[PDB]
Design a protein around this nucleic acid. Sequence first.
RNA 1: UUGGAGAGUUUGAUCCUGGCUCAGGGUGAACGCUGGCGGCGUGCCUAAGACAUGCAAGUCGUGCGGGCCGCGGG
Length: 148
Amino acid sequence: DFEEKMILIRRTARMQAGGRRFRFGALVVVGDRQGRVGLGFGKAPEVPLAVQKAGYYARRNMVEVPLQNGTIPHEIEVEFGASKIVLKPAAPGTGVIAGAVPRAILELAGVTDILTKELGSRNPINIAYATMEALRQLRTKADVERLR
RNA sequence: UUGGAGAGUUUGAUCCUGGCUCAGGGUGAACGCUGGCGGCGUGCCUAAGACAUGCAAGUCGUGCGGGCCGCGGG
Ligand SMILES: [Mg+2]
Ligand SMILES: [Mg+2]
Ligand SMILES: [Mg+2]
Ligand SMILES: [Mg+2]
Ligand SMILES: [Mg+2]
Ligand SMILES: [Mg+2]
Ligand SMILES: [Mg+2]
Ligand SMILES: [Mg+2]
Ligand SMILES: [Mg+2]
Ligand SMILES: [Mg+2]
Ligand SMILES: [Mg+2]
Ligand SMILES: [Mg+2]
Ligand SMILES: [Mg+2]
Ligand SMILES: [Mg+2]
Ligand SMILES: [Mg+2]
Ligand SMILES: [Mg+2]
Ligand SMILES: [Mg+2]
Ligand SMILES: [Mg+2]
Ligand SMILES: [Mg+2]
Ligand SMILES: [Mg+2]
Ligand SMILES: [Mg+2]
Ligand SMILES: [Mg+2]
């Protein structure tokens, strides 16, 4: 089994005659701390259901991150909508330098030393998606020469 | 490559834009409450406004001629 971290849990409303009615949403990252992470956004009429549902998708949508001594292979920058994440390789003594959202995802991915920066919109959901699709675009010296 | 964290706030809810605001470090500081010691710093950013009193530039008789006192003695 993997480790789970709930990043975001929010309540949203819809309007009807007689009043608003609610629904909940859960951002959950999932990982083994060895190079496998996944992200899922689960919504349901009560919190624990949504959280569990978030767990499910998190396992369905995974990604393999090419760790190297606990850092990522190259600098990467990715935009998701107006949200932009910046990822930069870092040496042993560094630590994971990131906001709560991208930290959780990187941390569970087995990243131990990295430099990051949130730019543009800092919408937690869009930043989480952006971080994922950034990890998903990480390549290795192997991958590179193999392609070319 | 030794280096980069963000959060609150427009909505019934959403994404975006955008401003405001906060957490950090800094000071020749001041103000409040409080106040035991020591070291190293450091102390009129305002009126280059006005200043009592003392002191902050003198030395040389191995450049010269004297005044006064004094020591030796003609
Ligand atoms: Mg966005
Ligand atoms: Mg854009
Ligand atoms: Mg490297
Ligand atoms: Mg923005
Ligand atoms: Mg914001
Ligand atoms: Mg790969
Ligand atoms: Mg650099
Ligand atoms: Mg910050
Ligand atoms: Mg308001
Ligand atoms: Mg409006
Ligand atoms: Mg409101
Ligand atoms: Mg803002
Ligand atoms: Mg301060
Ligand atoms: Mg005081
Ligand atoms: Mg006092
Ligand atoms: Mg002393
Ligand atoms: Mg002193
Ligand atoms: Mg004065
Ligand atoms: Mg002055
Ligand atoms: Mg005057
Ligand atoms: Mg005057
Ligand atoms: Mg004197």
